[PDB]
Design a protein around this ligand. Structure first.
Ligand SMILES: OC[C@H]1O[C@@H](O[C@@H]2[C@@H](O)[C@@H](O)O[C@H](CO)[C@H]2O)[C@H](O)[C@@H](O)[C@H]1O
Ligand SMILES: [Ca+2]
Length: 227
C-alpha cells in the first residue's frame, strides 16, 4: 500500500553493496517582487508543491552521499532578503546558496540496527514532510518508476503551527532497508531542520545517520522485502 502505517514495508537488496548516504536535490525558491505583502511566497504550502510544484523551479544541484548529522540551523540577519549560506558538510555540497529561501529533497533508505519501535522526531523552519516505507515513500529498488507516487505523509512539521514539531513511531526490523523521502522548504529568514530518533532498545538519541542512511540502485525486478 501507499498509505502511512505503524508497520511500514521494507526492502531486501541483493549483492550490489548499498552506497552510504541519501541523494539530495536542491531547488530555487524565490521571494515575491519587492513591495509584496508578505515578502515571501506561500506556494510551498500548495498541496501539490512537494509532488509536482517544486519541479517548475530552478534545479541547483543533485548530490549523493548525504549522511552523518543532517540537522542545521541557518540564522539570517533579517527577513525578506535573499542571503547566502552553506549546508553542513554532511550534505556533500560545498557551494553557497540562498539558505533563506530554497527547497530541498532527500531520498534513499533507512536501515535500522534494532528490531522494535522507533520514534523519529522532526522539526523545521519552514517545512519538512516525511514519507517512510515501501509504497509510502517509494517502491523497493523501483524508485524512478514510483518517485512521484508517494502517499500521505507519515510525519510533517510546518513553522507557524502550534508546535512546528512532529513524530513518527514505527516498528522496524533490523538490517531491512526502508524507503524514505524528506521534503524541506525555507520561504524566508531563518532556516532549520531537525531529524533524530530513539528506539525501545535504549535511551540513546541518534542524530548521526552515518550507519543508517543508504542508497540502492534500481533493478529490473526490484528488491522487495523478503523477511
Ligand atoms: O523566526 C523564524 C521565522 O521568521 C519569519 O519571519 C519573521 C516574521 O514572522 C515577522 O514577524 O517579521 C520578521 C522580520 O524580520 C521575521 O523575523 C519567516 O517568515 C519564517 O520562515 C521563519 O523563518
Ligand atoms: Ca524560514
Amino acid at each position: 500500500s501507499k498509505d502511512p502505517t505503524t508497520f511500514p514495508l521494507g526492502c531486501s537488496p541483493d549483492i550490489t553493496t548499498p552506497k552510504k548516504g541519501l541523494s539530495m536535490e536542491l531547488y530555487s525558491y524565490d521571494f515575491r517582487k519587492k513591495g509584496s505583502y508578505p515578502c515571501w511566497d506561500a506556494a510551498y504550502l500548495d498541496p501539490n508543491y512537494p509532488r509536482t510544484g517544486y519541479k517548475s523551479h530552478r534545479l541547483l544541484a543533485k548530490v549523493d552521499g548525504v549522511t552523518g548529522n543532517i540537522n542545521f540551523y541557518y540564522h539570517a540577519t533579517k527577513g525578506c532578503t535573499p542571503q547566502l549560506g552553506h549546508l553542513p558538510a554532511s550534505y556533500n555540497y560545498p557551494k553557497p546558496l540562498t539558505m533563506t529561501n530554497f527547497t530541498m529533497l532527500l531520498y534513499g533508505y533507512f536501515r535500522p540496527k534494532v528490531t522494535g519501535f522507533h520514534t523519529f522526531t522532526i522539526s523545521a523552519d519552514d517545512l519538512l514532510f516525511v514519507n517512510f516505507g515501501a509504497g509510502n515513500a517509494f517502491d523497493c529498488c523501483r524508485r524512478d518508476s514510483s518517485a512521484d507516487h508517494f502517499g500521505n505523509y507519515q510525519a510533517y512539521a510546518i513553522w507557524g503551527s502550534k508546535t512546528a514539531k512532529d513524530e513518527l513511531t514505527v516498528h522496524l526490523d533490523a538490517g531491512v532497508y526502508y524507503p524514505i523521502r524528506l521534503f524541506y522548504n525555507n520561504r524566508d529568514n531563518n532556516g532549520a531542520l531537525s531529524f533524530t530518533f530513539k528506539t525501545e532498545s535504549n535511551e540513546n538519541t541518534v542524530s548521526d545517520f552515518s550507519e543508517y542512511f543508504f542508497s540502492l540502485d534500481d533493478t529490473e525486478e526490484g528488491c522487495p522485502g523478503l523477511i
